[PDB]
Design an enzyme around this catalytic site. Structure first.
Site, PDB file in Angstrom:
ATOM      1  N   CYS A   1      13.719  25.416   0.502  1.00  0.00           N
ATOM      2  CA  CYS A   1      12.703  26.014  -0.363  1.00  0.00           C
ATOM      3  C   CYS A   1      11.816  24.904  -0.903  1.00  0.00           C
ATOM      4  CB  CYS A   1      13.341  26.804  -1.511  1.00  0.00           C
ATOM      5  SG  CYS A   1      14.727  27.851  -1.009  1.00  0.00           S
TER       6      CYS A   1
ATOM      7  N   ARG B   1       1.912 -10.761   7.137  1.00  0.00           N
ATOM      8  CA  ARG B   1       1.696  -9.506   6.401  1.00  0.00           C
ATOM      9  C   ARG B   1       2.833  -8.489   6.539  1.00  0.00           C
ATOM     10  NH1 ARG B   1      -1.386  -7.123   9.112  1.00  0.00           N
ATOM     11  NH2 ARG B   1      -2.989  -8.258  10.286  1.00  0.00           N
TER      12      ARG B   1
ATOM     13  N   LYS C   1       0.826  -1.203   0.000  1.00  0.00           N
ATOM     14  CA  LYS C   1       0.000   0.000   0.000  1.00  0.00           C
ATOM     15  C   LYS C   1       0.862   1.255   0.000  1.00  0.00           C
ATOM     16  CE  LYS C   1      -0.464  -0.457   5.011  1.00  0.00           C
ATOM     17  NZ  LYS C   1      -0.591   0.913   5.579  1.00  0.00           N
TER      18      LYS C   1
ATOM     19  N   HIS D   1      -5.300  -7.173  13.809  1.00  0.00           N
ATOM     20  CA  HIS D   1      -4.090  -6.361  13.713  1.00  0.00           C
ATOM     21  C   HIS D   1      -3.627  -5.937  15.107  1.00  0.00           C
ATOM     22  CE1 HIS D   1      -1.570  -4.092  10.838  1.00  0.00           C
ATOM     23  NE2 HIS D   1      -1.438  -3.213  11.814  1.00  0.00           N
TER      24      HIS D   1
ATOM     25  N   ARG E   1      -9.594   0.314  15.414  1.00  0.00           N
ATOM     26  CA  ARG E   1      -9.557   0.990  14.120  1.00  0.00           C
ATOM     27  C   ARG E   1     -10.745   0.562  13.245  1.00  0.00           C
ATOM     28  NH1 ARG E   1      -4.128   0.297  10.569  1.00  0.00           N
ATOM     29  NH2 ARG E   1      -4.895  -1.865  10.603  1.00  0.00           N
TER      30      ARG E   1
ATOM     31  N   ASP F   1      11.372  23.801  -3.990  1.00  0.00           N
ATOM     32  CA  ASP F   1      12.001  22.964  -5.022  1.00  0.00           C
ATOM     33  C   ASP F   1      13.524  22.895  -4.924  1.00  0.00           C
ATOM     34  OD1 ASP F   1       9.256  23.462  -6.384  1.00  0.00           O
ATOM     35  OD2 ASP F   1      10.280  25.401  -6.568  1.00  0.00           O
TER      36      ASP F   1
ATOM     37  N   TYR G   1      15.816  32.040   2.763  1.00  0.00           N
ATOM     38  CA  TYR G   1      14.750  32.939   3.200  1.00  0.00           C
ATOM     39  C   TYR G   1      14.962  33.428   4.630  1.00  0.00           C
ATOM     40  CZ  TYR G   1      11.976  31.458  -0.884  1.00  0.00           C
ATOM     41  OH  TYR G   1      11.523  31.198  -2.159  1.00  0.00           O
TER      42      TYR G   1
END
Lengths: 388, 388
Positions: free
Chosen positions: B315, B224, B40, B168, B138, B317, B268
């Site tokens: 920043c 799992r 997942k 679980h 859950r 990017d 910055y």
């Protein structure tokens, strides 16, 4: 409706709100001042394709993006508007930017030559904007003496078109006016020296959203609004004279309801326990979707205009909320994570504050798994699921 | 090579390490205990398509995904291995999961009835796994009396195949032995009750990655693993020696270099300033790529096998690194953000610690914009770019 073809957890993008916020920027600047819509990071998580499409209809002058692939993605979808790549496009990928007519950032002569070579090889002319480092220390020329020499050579390279020149404010969001004034003067002083050598570069620009609001002098020939187009401000030290509308709603659905007694543990590590009879809802949104795990036991989402706290840890794909105080709760009721719901708002800025960051990073956190649904004048007009 | 057709900022995925880590699970459990590879979140940011493709060849018994769209993604790329959807597939999308023989998590009769109706309509049978809440709080039945009543109904529903039943652990990572035995015992007690009602289910499972290694009793019919398959330990407190290999390397390249004197402000808000004559490099990776903004001025990337500090603000990017102490630094040199470089590792666990979260969130934060390049046995076998 409760459920539909699209994943329950979703982003609703309001295109008419983005175009509105765009029109607000035009009111602030002059009638002859051009606008470059910064839509990097996939239009700040809104989806570049659709955002670019609708801003192109609205008559935007330029687009700003971070990377080559961002620039190319827009061209692949038939965007005619000129596009500027702030970042470095490697020598190996130069064929593409010349082919699809993309404006490139340049701040050294060796790179300009390599670009020119490819421009002449395809018999086209590569538009370029020169970046100047006036204080930020990030990219651009710092030796202004060297800059003049190399920029003047580029002006005589027939393979290039020397269309623009720009810089970036280091503390406009922090509102250090003395430094902004200082950075602006340095910039104009380099331009004066170039104009004395008979070189008029048509597009001088420096202002991002912070300087667009505050510093009327920084407007120059073009202006670079980004986050502000998406219903948020860059900081708290800005004037906010514009009227912004909500552009994104990050939403999900109630997927499970259980009634539990007091002393009932919820989540990993038994971090939460009920102190009363409670109704717990589970929602299919987790940290892999962009919901920061630090919101575990300290945020409240909107459900039917009521605040509902996250209880227990945020899982990868889901989390639990206490809905005991909300009446008439059902499977498939909307749960808003970011945005408005019935005279009540959990704004993107509120979320950014809670996890000690800024609205830009919150938007960018919204992952590939979250489909984007698109709205215009209230009606849904399309969608993208990135898993496709 | 310095640069190529792929974005400089990238994720190198090593499929043979993933298969190796899978084989480490094979050694731990028997030959008689099946393995559901949980992939997942787009295989924890590794890319579900390629990872599922190779775990299928490896002979994995089942796949586990969070959402319907993740399950259909696998099926659409030709994956034939059985796939369990952990989450909730809404009533509007039940046609798809019946058509592509996807296994669905069920814990209420109303939903079972809805799934059976579509199943019958297509003259097919829907495989289902029943979630039992044993302590996590859950999803799943908390009312074990009801659980039995509704499961026996489902056994007489010829449009469903009652293949699995599972729960679980809530604190396998915290190493809470008592609460784990408490959870396990409830689960097994429920199992025993059902057998006395003449009902057996072939796929009983409860062990996530931490319970696989520490709790031998919790293996049952199937196991799992998730995060363990991608070279990260599920707990700090684990027993049992295993050979985990590094599966992911989050890397970028040097894009700009410059010499700067002392008193030179960077990034910055003028947050960093040099204390000496320095050589500073800019790298094209930011928080829109999954590099957390809170690493601004408190993390170190690897360059030529040596630690280099991030200076100034990260920043959206890009960000800057101090490379003064590293000799022979040129444009195009590899910088590792996560992973190994020359006898030195900046692990995903170390970054998870730094920004006070867990490895899964770090991997999940690596955004759409970061391309995945794939390797098998030292050869580059492919690449995906989600901007395409």
């Amino acid at each position: 409706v409760k459920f539909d073809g699209v994943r329950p957890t979703r982003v609703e993008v309001y295109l008419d709100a983005i175009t509105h916020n765009f029109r607000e920027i035009k009111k602030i600047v002059g009638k002859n001042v051009k606008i470059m819509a910064v839509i990097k990071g996939d239009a700040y998580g809104h989806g570049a394709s659709y955002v670019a499409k609708f801003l192109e209809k609205e008559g935007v002058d330029y687009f700003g993006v971070a990377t080559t692939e961002e620039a190319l993605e827009l061209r692949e979808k038939g965007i005619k508007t000129p596009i500027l790549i702030f970042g470095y496009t490697p020598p190996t990928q130069l064929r593409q930017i010349v082919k699809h007519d993309l404006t490139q950032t340049v701040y050294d002569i060796k790179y300009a030559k390599e670009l020119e070579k490819e421009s002449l090889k395809q018999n086209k002319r590569a538009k370029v904007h020169i970046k100047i480092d006036t204080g930020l220390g990030r990219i651009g020329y710092i030796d202004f003496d060297l800059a003049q020499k190399e920029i003047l050579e580029m002006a005589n390279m027939r393979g290039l078109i020397l269309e623009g020149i720009y810089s970036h404010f280091a503390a406009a969001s922090e509102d250090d006016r003395d430094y902004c004034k200082e950075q602006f003067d340095k910039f104009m002083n380099l331009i004066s020296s170039l104009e004395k050598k008979r070189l008029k570069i048509p597009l001088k620009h420096i202002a991002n959203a912070a300087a667009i609001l505050n510093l009327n002098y920084s407007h120059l020939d073009m202006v670079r609004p980004g986050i502000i187009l998406f219903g948020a401000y860059p900081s708290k030290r800005v004037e906010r004279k514009v009227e912004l509308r909500e552009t994104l709603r990050f939403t999900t659905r109630v997927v499970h309801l259980k009634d539990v007694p007091a002393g009932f543990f919820i989540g990993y590590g038994k971090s939460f326990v009920t102190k009363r009879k409670s109704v717990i809802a589970t929602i299919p949104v987790g940290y892999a979707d962009g919901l920061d795990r630090r919101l575990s036991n300290n945020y409240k989402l909107l459900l039917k205009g009521k605040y509902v706290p996250i209880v227990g840890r945020v899982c990868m794909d889901q989390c639990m909320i206490d809905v005991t105080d909300v009446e008439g709760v059902e499977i498939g009721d909307e749960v808003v994570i970011i945005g408005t719901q019935n005279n009540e708002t959990v704004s993107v800025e509120s979320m950014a504050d809670k996890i000690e960051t800024i609205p830009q990073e919150v938007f960018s956190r919204i992952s590939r798994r979250v489909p984007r649904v698109y709205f215009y004048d209230g009606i849904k007009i399309g969608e993208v699921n990135y898993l496709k």
